[PDB]
């Protein structure tokens, strides 16, 4: 009943940008000071994974 559109989830971009900028520094402690790290989306396989 009513209009249809896909289900979705909203995450504020400023908070997520800050959270990534805070996790990247904790990750550099194990993988190098003044180095670059990347993260793309999932590889593939199970839908639940």
């Amino acid at each position, epitope marked *: *009943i*009513g*209009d249809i*559109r896909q289900a*979705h989830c909203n995450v504020s971009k400023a908070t997520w940008n800050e959270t990534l900028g805070k996790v990247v520094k904790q990750l550099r402690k194990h993988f190098g000071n003044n180095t670059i790290i990347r993260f793309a989306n999932s590889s593939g396989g199970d839908l639940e994974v």
Partner: antibody
């Protein structure tokens, strides 16, 4: 781009009731509100009522209480106007009006009612004459 | 209630001539609840300007809208024989919409 398609003209006896359909084509159904603007033959435009289709946000004119009833039918995606106790004053052309906006933005689940009307139905000529 | 009035009942204009229609409100209203409509020869009304200044989709440059508080004006710098007919102003703010009585324009002669 959206479009409004109404019913054909009708003739009703005084004191009876009339029901007019209006089906939008190619647009969001539950967002913007459907207002009804009528024009008595030779006079200015008169606002009848307005109603968000499914949400129910509606309000009729002061002149049309105990005679007007706006409803809809989402299986057919068509709104309806019902006017009772017809007099020769109620003769005229009834318009189905609506606002259209953005179109690309789909995540808007809200309901709007205080808007103008750029999308107009061709009109439905209601003639009250016994 | 909120009722609107239109002053220049019949406004005569030739080609290139400039006119100014008025729409006075009873109370003080916001400058975001006034629209202007064009109605040519008993056909479908076309929304000219929303929010008393926002020119609608495809409406030409010849239609400029102004107004604040009580009086709202619609200025037509130039006009073709295309845009002739009855102009109406609508208050679309509160829970009760109300239109202006209409104002017809003539080919000045």
């Amino acid at each position: 781009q959206v479009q409004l398609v109404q019913s054909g003209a009708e003739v009703r006896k005084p004191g009876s009731s009339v029901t007019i359909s209006c089906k939008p084509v190619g647009g969001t159904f539950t967002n913007f509100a459907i207002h009804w603007v009528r024009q008595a033959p030779g006079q200015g435009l008169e606002w009848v009522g307005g109603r968000v289709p499914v949400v129910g946000i509606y309000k009729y004119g002061k002149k049309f209480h105990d005679r007007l009833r706006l409803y809809e039918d989402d299986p057919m995606k068509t709104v309806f106007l019902e006017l009772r106790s017809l007099t020769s004053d109620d003769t005229g052309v009834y318009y189905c009006t609506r606002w259209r906006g953005c179109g690309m933005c789909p995540y808007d689940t809200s309901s709007y009612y205080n808007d103008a009307s750029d999308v107009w139905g061709p009109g439905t000529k209601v003639i009250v004459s016994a | 209630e909120i009722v609107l009035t239109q002053s220049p009942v019949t406004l005569s204009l030739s080609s290139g001539e400039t006119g100014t229609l008025s729409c006075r409100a009873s109370q003080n209203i916001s400058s975001s609840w006034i629209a202007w409509y064009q109605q040519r020869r008993g056909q479908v009304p076309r929304l000219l300007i929303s929010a008393a200044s926002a020119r609608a989709a495809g409406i030409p440059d010849r239609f400029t809208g102004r107004g604040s508080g009580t009086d709202f004006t619609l200025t037509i710098t130039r006009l073709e024989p295309e845009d002739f007919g009855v102009y109406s102003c609508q208050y679309y703010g509160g829970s009760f919409f109300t239109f202006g009585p209409g104002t017809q324009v003539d080919v000045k002669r």
